[PDB]
Amino acid sequence: SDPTHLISKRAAGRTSVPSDKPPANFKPHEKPLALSYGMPNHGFFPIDSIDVNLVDYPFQKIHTPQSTVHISRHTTDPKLIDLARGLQYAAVEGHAPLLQFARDFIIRTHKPNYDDWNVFITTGASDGLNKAADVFLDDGDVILVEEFTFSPFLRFSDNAGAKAVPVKINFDNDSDGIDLTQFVDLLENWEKHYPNLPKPKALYTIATGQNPTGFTQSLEFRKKIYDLAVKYDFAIIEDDPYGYLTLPKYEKPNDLEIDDYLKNHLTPSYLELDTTGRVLRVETFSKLFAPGLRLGFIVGHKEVIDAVKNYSDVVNRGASGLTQTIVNNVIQENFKGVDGWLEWILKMRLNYSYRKDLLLYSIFESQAYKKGYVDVIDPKAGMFVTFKINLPKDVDVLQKMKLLLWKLISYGILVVPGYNMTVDLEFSKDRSNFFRLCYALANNDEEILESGKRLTDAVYEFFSNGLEFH
Amino acid sequence: SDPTHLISKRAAGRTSVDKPPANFKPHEKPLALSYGMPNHGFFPIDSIDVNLVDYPFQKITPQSTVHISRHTTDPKLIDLARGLQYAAVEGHAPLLQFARDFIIRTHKPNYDDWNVFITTGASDGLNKAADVFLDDGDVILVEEFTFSPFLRFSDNAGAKAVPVKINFDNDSDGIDLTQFVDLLENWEKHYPNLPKPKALYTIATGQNPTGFTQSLEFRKKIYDLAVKYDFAIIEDDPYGYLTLPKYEKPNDLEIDDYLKNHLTPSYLELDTTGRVLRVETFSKLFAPGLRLGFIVGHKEVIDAVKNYSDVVNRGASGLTQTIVNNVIQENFKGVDGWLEWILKMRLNYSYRKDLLLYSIFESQAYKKGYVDVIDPKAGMFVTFKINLPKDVDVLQKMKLLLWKLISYGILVVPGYNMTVDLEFSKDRSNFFRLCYALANNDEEILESGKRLTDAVYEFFSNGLEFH
Ligand SMILES: *Cc1c(COP(=O)(O)O)cnc(C)c1O
Ligand SMILES: *Cc1c(COP(=O)(O)O)cnc(C)c1O
């Protein structure tokens, strides 16, 4: 019922921040003055107050006064950060009101199934993932990674000295992502696949809205992965940057309440299965608030958080206090905490839902789709679409996909080929016949319809040309 | 020449971030389904007003303010469209340009092939610097009293820290140059098992904790040693800009006079090849809670630092870069106006230091010769010496005296807590570091010196006992 055994020797070996016996008659003074710490008094700070002027809904153009939060030098509200503390040296794990908000948010959305967990403020998802790779992987360890993944993760596993072993993704329309049959086979027959590698130490899974594939693991699929995590004693790194952006299944384009969302829409976190702290959940404010914050958090066992703290003290000594201050006060004062912030996530959900269906319509209406040259996985969450290219089985996948990429660029549509998002290119070659599409960037519906048209026009010509740029 | 040979194998090894068909014209105006990032329309924040003080300790002719809008075309400003969006890990271009223009004004490198990189503070710059110069098993020369967290960064790189003795005379430059030359010339006699040092970590101005400032002439001797023995200089300078005129009994500097006559030159100004990496921060001159700074070094050192940053620290907060950049450009009107803000800060720190020194000179502990103070030339720290008899246990008596200071309601840092190696430095650990930066007002500084000096006087009156 603790994960001490899974913490890397490297992260456990890092040390922490008078210690001897005070003399018999020693009494501390009740109001000491300090000449100790190298902190400038807040009087030195150029910034006396900040007004943060907000939108009420995404894409609002600025009857009703505009929503504004005022951040003063001083506050006594325990749910707010003032600039006197916000602009001063702070605990490396984060400001208290932002840590409490993250606890409350995780209790509401994804309550861990054990009591000895904690949160830690990070500088985003990639910061959380590096913290997790460090805390679980020693030099020589193996981490299991989805064969198509968030590429930057491999830099963090490489940094920890770990080898990435690819886990096959099932590309059926009803897929959970990971191919469970091939995952079980890899774990049951480890010595036959990888005779010279130790048994895996961890699994990195983007379980909801998988990047790139868009797949989402069912609750029953997650129970089986967790059960295998117990049986083969590996850690789970859960990355969930947009699992809150749940998307109803496609219907032709032309008021969800919180309780119904939490209960029936939100797919449970691995935290909800975890009894021992073998799960570390990575969150970010990047995709729900803004990437430029460089702010997120992790959720894990007390003992895992303590080891992350000692690592942060070396390589990343705190998220920007000014940003923690702005983000905390906006969430607590304007959005009135957890439920209000969920209501802002549900407004974003509606936009993303409309955007995903529009791009899917733009494709379904295409000649390339109707002839069967292209297909689409309907994503259940997030901002990504798998766009499949039905190349003949016997053509060189990498070679034709690269030739097709040049064609898309010439047709004025930029995409990411799946071969760029692999743990191992040779391993994943045969399933690399897809582009990842993102409908998060477009300014308007016109750009989404036109994006899908250029995409499908380019594939159509490429197929008409006999799989040639011509 | 160039510092290529000085870059660690580890940092040099990190990597960065087919043939077009015949009749391939790109499209004039492509649309993106590529980059996984929200349109700025999704951002909750439309605009930000940052409301400023005109001088330190000002209490709130309308208040000075900066409007940060969603969009700008001013190339010197960062807007929220770009500030709140994914950005280059090295920093926003306006903030990188300000750091360039600032260093050209204050500390122009003596070579052309240097660049800046935005960091999350001095400790972040120092970790970047330890990684970019130190391989597993390398040696770094560190001042025997130092900024202790540096040792976490050097340990992280697998480097051994060798202490360099500090001279404690009232006219010291800091590092004892005679013992430094002895250490380098007789390296195999002091350390027959360690490799030749790879680098030196020096807080050359306003040394933490001692407060000493190396003279230009001393810096020239340290640089020539760095060339002869071929080691990198990590220059850490969080408050060298806060220059302090020598003590005068307490009771309008111009930029050009300050720059020419007050500011001590950076190792950058002696560097001809890029063997110097300067660490700067916004922590001590703007606010610590920014978590913002920059480093200055050779193009190729900065490139390695970029690839390290992609792994362990993927950019200073964009929103913070936005606010600091736009405050410095809109309110302060760039480099010279920011220097005027620094000069107002300087006047404050100058009065505070003289006030603390005054409180100490007036005390019986000072008059009886139980204590002494180095007059700092820059920064926020004072070495407070304890004249223990030569034959007492320095560590035993200084621990006991610290308990006495705490009972008297004065908190200081003992020098023995800021050593590279405690046994090496114990004989010179008979001091406390004092910091006059935290106090709210003059009354707290005077009361602080009184409690400090009373505590030591009681301790010596007690025969060096708590009693
Ligand atoms: C966007 C993304 C991240 C990185 O988020 P940051 O907060 O910008 O570091 C990590 N993982 C996945 C799966 C992502 O899509
Ligand atoms: C304060 C200080 C630092 C650390 O500054 P940050 O910007 O807060 O990381 C480093 N070196 C010295 C000498 C300092 O005094």
Ligand SMILES: [K+]
């Ligand atoms: K199936």
